[PDB]
Amino acid sequence: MDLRDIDLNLLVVFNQLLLDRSVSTAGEKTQPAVSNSLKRLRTALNDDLEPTPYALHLAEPVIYALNTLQTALTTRDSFDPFASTRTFNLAMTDIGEMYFMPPLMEALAQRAPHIQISTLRPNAGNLKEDMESGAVDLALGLLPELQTGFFQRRLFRHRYVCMFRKDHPSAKSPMSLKQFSELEHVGVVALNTGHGEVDGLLERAGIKRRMRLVVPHFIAIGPILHSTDLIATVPQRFAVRCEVPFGLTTSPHPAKLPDIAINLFWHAKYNRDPGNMWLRQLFVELFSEARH
Amino acid sequence: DIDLNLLVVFNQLLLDRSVSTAGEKLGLTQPAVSNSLKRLRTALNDDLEPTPYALHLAEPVIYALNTLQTALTTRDSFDPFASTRTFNLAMTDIGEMYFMPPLMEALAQRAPHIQISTLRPNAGNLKEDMESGAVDLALGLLPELQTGFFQRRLFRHRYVCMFRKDHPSAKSPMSLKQFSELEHVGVVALNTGHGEVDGLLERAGIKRRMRLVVPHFIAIGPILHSTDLIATVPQRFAVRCEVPFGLTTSPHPAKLPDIAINLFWHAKYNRDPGNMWLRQLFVELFSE
Amino acid sequence: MDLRDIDLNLLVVFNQLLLDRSVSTAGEKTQPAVSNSLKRLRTALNDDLEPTPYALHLAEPVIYALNTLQTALTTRDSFDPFASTRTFNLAMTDIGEMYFMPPLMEALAQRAPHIQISTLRPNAGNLKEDMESGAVDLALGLLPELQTGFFQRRLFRHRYVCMFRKDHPSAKSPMSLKQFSELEHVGVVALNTGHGEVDGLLERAGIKRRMRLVVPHFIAIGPILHSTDLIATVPQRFAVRCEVPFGLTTSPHPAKLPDIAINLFWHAKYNRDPGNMWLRQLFVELFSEARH
Amino acid sequence: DIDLNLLVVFNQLLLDRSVSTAGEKLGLTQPAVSNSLKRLRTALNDDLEPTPYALHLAEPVIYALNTLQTALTTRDSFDPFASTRTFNLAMTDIGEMYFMPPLMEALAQRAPHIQISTLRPNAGNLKEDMESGAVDLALGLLPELQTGFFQRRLFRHRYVCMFRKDHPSAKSPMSLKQFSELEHVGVVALNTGHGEVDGLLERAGIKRRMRLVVPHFIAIGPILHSTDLIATVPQRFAVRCEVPFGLTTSPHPAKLPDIAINLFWHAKYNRDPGNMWLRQLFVELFSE
């Protein structure tokens, strides 16, 4: 079929036939080189192109089809954030979501209005294989399982802090270890995260706590602290998200706890993928505290 | 006038109709349980894991041994002022966010020394752990729990549209046309009642520009606060979010079904003072 | 536990303790036989039963529990349709459903108000195994695959007829073969049913048909015939269901077609199951044309 | 100015990137297709089933070869008065019942010699058979069809409650209380849009005495006619049922989402005169 339509370079001259005439110039754009090829376009196609109906039926659909090969001039190395309609999938924890997503979406509103963002927890499917396959573009957090086929970039470190409602009858900042051990706590187990070791670190330090409430995740901590005299041990970025909205106060933690490293992860296979690079750089711009 | 002790043997000739056999649990030797089985087949005129009409009789007699055992066994006393007991409650993140703050506020004045621990509904498995007492109460939409579970509807979730106050476009009440013009945050919420919403809107032919999709509800407040995105959320989540994050709601322009949030407890703990006390507290605080 | 509660025949005497006193008579219902056993009921249970609180806590829950063993007096051979809350599962075709279900539900409204009926097509799961397991109580139709472990009872035979709208411009009853072959048809493939052989029987008889429309099932036939000049070859029971509602006329079929046998099927395992027997007999009563 | 014939080869170096290889379909020998592949890798400076940035270029060039081939290939003429062509349409039983009578009535006056054949949506598979032309049009709620399928919403199903006219209790409009008092017929309708209804009512906490459950809609009319049962049905089924079976409807007291019924056709037949004619007929008859 198309092998019988043969040379389509003659369809590039049919672009000069999609433009009307300009023929000696369209040759010079030569006229004898055109003449045989267009005559051959006609030996291939009965119509004398002198504009003919079916010639108009060929003129425009040729252009778009020819143009997409020229629209292809933008290489794979090209990526236009302001026009992209691509979806990016990002792995992060609930805290990661709560912290990263609002300023990201805020920035994306201007820089990439037409893209879509989807998030997931680092345990939805299998993170490694999904990132290698391109199902997940980036991951955020500690993630010690991401090693061989993965690059990583440090975004920031944040400590655990103690949080409680601002008009607490007795809680003070900076909080003493004594008061910490006398007040009542709401704790997050946070299974399979970096935050699970906290209870062990405290107990192995001889720091007893009256655990009035234990929840598996962070969603309710803000409202709980707001309406009770409980206090909580939480990551500082979470505390940052919660302080003003729930009328909460934080304090440097009276206990010795390690800080948490939050890194940006991507697979080696996409180290040079333009869209991935762009989003990566946006994350670095918004959240990296290197030059602080 | 046929002896009843053999009937006592029957219920474990049912649980261990699996013929492992029961006698080891009974404390009686298998020959004695076989003599007992002879007394059974004789008194019933039926040879009973081959199960006959004894299957038909098993449930009337299971209904018999149940009430007799409960009325005989003494139950654990419960003093709310003094109790140091830990209650384990199964609920969703929405459920946690809505229930826990007013509950804990209430527990501070009614039962100062008890401990509460919450968990996600699936998968303990929940029915098993509620049978064993590992989980005391369950909350929300849980279809699996019918046989052996008492239930009670606390309330009905109604869906609304949530956005920030000073949103340049969004109005209340919002049109269905404006709803499809604006940009949305999606909450997957897999395997919960709220995980159906996107599907419902899809099947209704409601076109929706999905700018952001998250699996859960934790970031919705902050996200709406800092963007012009709109969300489809349960009303009570919205009431938990409005003031802290500076958001308003509109009645949802699309026809969405309400979702009944119920309270569940296993039949084995229907008479347990502590369980009764806590679940009555849930009814007092949250039922409409 | 209950082995320590020992003799519960003493709970049957505790039924005479659930009734209040009547003691010499409750003995005669003897008094010394009672006396040691009730004294022993007391050596087992501290309370002096003289009505005591916990004695009242024992009185009623004992009765219901004792009564269910006496409520058990109704044997497996017993089945009360007027009080049953049992669900019956019935396998049948769409035509079978359309024909059987309305007079059945009509009859059930008085005879078994509290039972539930569910239906399914003879190809939902695997019919044989589901009927042997009790997942399906009865099946209705031809069903030649139901042989070894199954009993069957003939309900009726019905022929194929020709159906068309009552004010058809030309269609007549009784219809001639000529007119049948000249008019236009809507046909039902009815895959994996007894009705699929029809087209083959007609074609192998040299009867050409102008098939204007072919549908896989019967749901639309009535409305289609009502609004068109098409005619259809359909089972007569279907025609019975459709004639008046859709303003249709039927005619004895001009072509030689075999009639269809509709039988009632149940598994041997449930030949004597009282509820099954009852429903079976209700089907025989409502639909059997033996003594016609 | 790089030659285009190699680009023609590329699209089958894509379909047969599976490297079976394409050349057998091409009619060219594999050595010539390998020389062609050398011209490819040379002109593109990229070594392309290992697929590189040529994957990025494959779709712009698939977008290229598509329009060029369609505009070149002559299409089949269609004369509705004379056409003897058979159209295969995929739809549900509800869809069949609603669409077929007014369609056939219309076809009797517009295209007397064509033949129509309907089938159930799953599983041809539908997308495959619509690609091959075995199935011409699809109708209803079909989520699978997005890539390579043009679609258009005909209308929206709204759920109502149906019962017989002289029903001793049922009123219009029906209360939600009366809805839970009366007895119901259930339609499973597995894997259709309407198979969700029971689940929606369940999750809303709408108690429903389910006296009868059937898998499909064929018997609902006759059943309602001869009993005091009520049903939850799409409005158009109800309008097909009211007069023949002596039934009325009430607005559904429960909040149920509408269900968009769309019309689907494969992109490969978007320019086909007959397909265009029939689907335009569907739009003329049924779109609201």
Author numbering:
A (entry chain A), C (entry chain A): 1 to 29, 33 to 52, 61 to 303
B (entry chain B), D (entry chain B): 5 to 52, 61 to 300
Provide excerpts from the study:
of transcription factors found in prokaryotes. N-terminal winged Helix Turn Helix (wHTH) DNA Binding Domain (DBD). two Rossmann fold-like sub domains (RD1, RD2). conformational changes which modify LTTR DNA binding sites promoter region DNA.
apo-DntR homotetramers adopt a compact homotetrameric configuration. well-defined electron density for the wHTH regions. apo-DntR they cannot bind salicylate and DntR cannot be activated. constraints in the crystal - packed closer to the tetrameric core. solution is different to that observed in the crystal. apo-DntR reported here result in very poor matches.
